[PDB]
């Protein structure tokens, strides 16, 4: 039984992340992993979209702890952002790990795309 201070960013953000973790569990996505994203989109009836790709960054600001992902579709260069705490995703699967010496793979956009096909 304690009254609360003006530190409500951390407790709204903390209980938001704890509620979204209570809904679905999420293992942590470090930068450089090769992961899958299973997305729920209505009216398509397939209800499990395929998003393979390589995480480029993690702009973690509490409930927007996000994923900058990249996969070469047969045309070119698709770069999708994912909020990890959104109710629209279903599960994540850390398939591989590049073991890259960088926190921000923005060089890898405009490189040779044989090193970017998931």
């Amino acid at each position: 039984q304690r009254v609360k201070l003006g530190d409500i960013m951390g407790i709204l953000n903390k209980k938001a992340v704890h509620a979204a973790e209570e809904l679905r569990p999420v293992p942590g996505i470090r930068t450089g992993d090769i992961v899958q994203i299973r997305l729920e989109v209505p009216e398509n009836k397939r209800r499990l979209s395929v998003y393979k790709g390589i995480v480029i960054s993690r702009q973690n600001a509490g409930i927007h702890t996000t994923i900058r992902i990249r996969r070469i579709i047969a045309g070119v260069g698709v770069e999708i952002v994912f909020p990890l705490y959104s109710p629209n995703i279903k599960e994540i699967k850390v398939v591989s790990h590049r073991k890259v010496r960088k926190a921000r793979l923005y060089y890898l956009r405009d490189k040779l795309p044989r090193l970017s096909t998931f």
């Binding site: 609360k4 003006g6 409500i8 960013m9 407790i11 709204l12 953000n13 938001a16 979204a20 729920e40 509490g62 409930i63 927007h64 909020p83 705490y85 959104s86 109710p87 629209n88």
Partner: protein, 212 residues
């Protein structure tokens, strides 16, 4: 003339509410340091208009002068810093004796207006106050970013008043309008409100229902 009494609260950062439908909305978080106690009502009898005078930010008595604290102890309430009224039509039932009004009156009313001191930017130029254009950056030009022509020729002989000059941009209060309410917290004393209030986290903020 406002359509009802409002409250005032302080801004405490911004975040994103995740709606269970799947959308991501950017909300501002509102706290409440102390309850918005009605301190002084001014009716049609003893005043030319009708308004309900509330206040905010209970403090130490050293922080508050003798006319202020004498005015607040005339109502028999706590000594508090901020103090504003809302002008309201003559159907009011408000006693000035310590009406610690609770914040339930805004959730069903999914439209609210907010006023606040925007962040000041000091003496800024005409390129950002009034959204002008700059000159040519090159091609031998010399009037980069400058104010350009100011008036017409000989026949005015002066410049028109209210002409767009550089000056102090921010610092005055603004009201942004019809902002739809969202998830209140009956224990965290925190109201989500989808929008962008005027000012950084910490300032006073009028939170009063709409006037459409």
């Amino acid at each position: 003339v406002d359509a009802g009494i409002g409250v005032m609260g302080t801004k405490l950062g911004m975040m994103s509410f995740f709606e269970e439908d799947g959308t991501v909305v950017p909300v501002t978080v509102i706290g409440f340091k102390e309850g918005n106690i009605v301190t002084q009502v001014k009716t049609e009898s003893t005043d030319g208009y009708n308004a309900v005078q509330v206040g905010y930010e209970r403090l130490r008595d050293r922080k508050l002068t003798m006319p202020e604290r004498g005015h607040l102890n005339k109502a028999g309430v706590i000594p508090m810093r901020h103090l504003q009224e809302f002008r309201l039509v003559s159907v009011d039932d408000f006693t000035p004796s310590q009406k610690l009004l609770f914040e339930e009156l805004f959730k069903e009313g999914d439209m609210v207006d907010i006023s606040g001191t925007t962040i000041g930017k000091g003496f800024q130029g005409g390129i950002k106050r009034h959204n002008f254009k700059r000159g040519l950056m090159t091609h031998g030009s010399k009037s980069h970013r400058a104010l350009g022509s100011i008036g017409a020729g000989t026949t005015p002989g002066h410049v028109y008043k209210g002409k767009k000059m550089p000056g102090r941009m921010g610092g005055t209060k603004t009201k942004i309008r019809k902002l739809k309410i969202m998830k209140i917290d009956t224990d965290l004393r925190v109201v989500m409100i989808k929008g962008a209030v005027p000012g950084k986290p910490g300032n006073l903020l009028r939170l009063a229902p709409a006037k459409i």
